[PDB]
A paper describes a structure:
Here we have determined by cryo-electron microscopy (cryo-EM) structures of the head and tail components of YSD1, a phage infecting Salmonella Typhi. We investigated the structure of the recently characterised phage YSD1 as an example of flagellotropic χ-like phages and more generally phages with long, non-contractile tails. Samples of YSD1 imaged by EM showed characteristic features of siphoviruses: an icosahedral capsid and a flexible tail tube of ~220 nm in length. Cryo-EM analysis of YSD1 allowed structure determination of the head and tail components at resolutions of 3.8 Å and 3.5 Å, respectively, and the generation of de novo models for the major capsid ([name]), auxiliary protein (YSD1_16) and tail-tube protein (YSD1_22).
To investigate the assembly of the major capsid component, we determined the structures of the major capsid protein both within the assembled head by cryo-EM and in its soluble form by X-ray crystallography of the recombinant protein (resolution: 2.6 Å). Comparison of the two structures revealed major rearrangements correlating with the transition from a soluble, monomeric form to an assembled capsid. These rearrangements are unlikely to be caused by crystal packing since the same compact conformations are seen for both of the independent molecules in the asymmetric unit of the crystal despite completely different environments. Taking the compact crystal structure as a reference, these rearrangements can be described as the stretch of the N-terminal arm and E-loop in opposite directions with regard to the central P-domain. In these conformations, the two structural elements form an inter-molecular beta-sheet with their counterparts of the neigboring subunits within a capsomer, which results in a circular strand exchange. In addition to interlocking the capsomer, these interactions allow for quasi-equivalent interactions modulated by varying bending angles of the N-terminal arm and E-loop. These quasi-equivalent interactions observed in the asymmetric unit of the capsid ultimately allow the formation of pentamers and hexamers with different curvatures, which are required to assemble the large T7 icosahedral shell.
Author numbering: 4 to 93, 109 to 233, 240 to 260, 264 to 278, 282 to 357
The structure:
């Protein structure tokens, strides 16, 4: 058998393709107990108590909800049988090879969970997660309601100057409503919003005198399917244009709202928060993922399990906006 330390050496050694939305969640807190403290994350002294309510059949049950300074994150726990005879696309040598593939698959399950939690927190200001007594609960971080907009880019006589002004309103509202007052320079478009912005913008956007300047965070996405850096939109305020068409799997959905545009700043200063994983003898383990191997009977197999308890909390919930453009 291998110790957690030995399994972490393997699990952590390789490089994994960059996460798009988490680039705005650079900070990290590995909490010492089972609870996450928002007072140690959220900047706004009025917004340090997010509203947590059960999400039952899509509907948020606000009645049985409360404001809380502290949260108990549910464990993300992939568990797989270690079969040395397992089919891997590329005796003890093969056993180790199986463990490493499984550890990589587990690390991916945790990493993608962080990314989708980042996507939801940044886009909506709230994240739907697994609860303690309910299968799903909503953690509302209280982003200003003016930062969730609606417009119709499919209406008659809409121009590129009108579309940029919708985007600019959003960044000016962020400047007004955010702690820092940061000027947004990044605009993540969903695929339908982008196609819409290009349907209307055409000649004025990509032509001989286009606004798009198509010419090192912008080049790390070349080999990433779903992410496309389009260039800076030159304005007499040079906007960075991102298009996100990434999909993930639910027990397959789009990471970014396809018919919307999200504006975001580095001032969101999102924090990857992690609860400590309780271990019988070793006590609490403050880790992002925690691999454990063991032999058992009933069934007579060897198991590998990577446990983690995450939440992606924004420091400044008001440092981003979402603008829906179609229906």
């Amino acid at each position: 058998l291998y110790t957690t330390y030995q399994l972490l050496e393997v699990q952590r050694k390789l490089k994994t393709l960059p996460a798009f939305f988490l680039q705005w969640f650079p900070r990290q807190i590995n909490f010492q107990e089972d609870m996450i403290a928002f007072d140690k994350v959220i900047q706004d002294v009025t917004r340090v108590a997010p509203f947590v309510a059960p999400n039952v059949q899509g509907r948020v049950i606000k009645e049985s909800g409360y404001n809380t300074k502290t949260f108990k994150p549910a464990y993300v726990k992939p568990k797989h049988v270690i079969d040395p005879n397992m089919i891997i696309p590329r005796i003890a040598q093969r056993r180790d090879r199986v463990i490493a593939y499984l550890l990589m698959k587990h690390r991916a399950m945790h990493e993608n969970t962080w990314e989708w939690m980042a996507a939801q927190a940044a886009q909506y200001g709230y994240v739907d997660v697994q609860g303690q007594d309910y299968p799903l609960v909503r953690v509302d971080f209280g982003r200003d309601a003016a930062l969730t907009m609606t417009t119709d880019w499919t209406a008659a006589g809409v121009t590129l100057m009108d579309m940029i002004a919708d985007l600019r309103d959003g960044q000016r509202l962020v400047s007004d409503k955010s702690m820092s007052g940061t000027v947004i320079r990044d605009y993540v478009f969903g695929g339908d919003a982008w196609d819409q912005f290009v349907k209307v913008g055409g000649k004025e956007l990509w032509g001989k005198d286009g606004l798009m300047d198509s010419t090192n965070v912008t080049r790390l996405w070349d080999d990433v399917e779903g992410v496309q850096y389009m260039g800076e939109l030159v304005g007499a305020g040079r906007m960075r244009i991102w298009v996100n068409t990434q999909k993930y799997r639910d027990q397959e959905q789009f990471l970014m709202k396809q018919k919307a545009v999200m504006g975001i700043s580095s001032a969101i200063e999102g924090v990857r928060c992690f609860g400590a994983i309780l271990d019988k003898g070793a006590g609490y383990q403050a880790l992002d993922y925690f691999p454990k191997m063991w032999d058992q009977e009933d069934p007579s197999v060897e198991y590998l399990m990577s446990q983690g308890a995450p939440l992606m909390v924004p420091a400044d919930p008001n440092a981003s906006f979402l603008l829906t453009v179609m229906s």
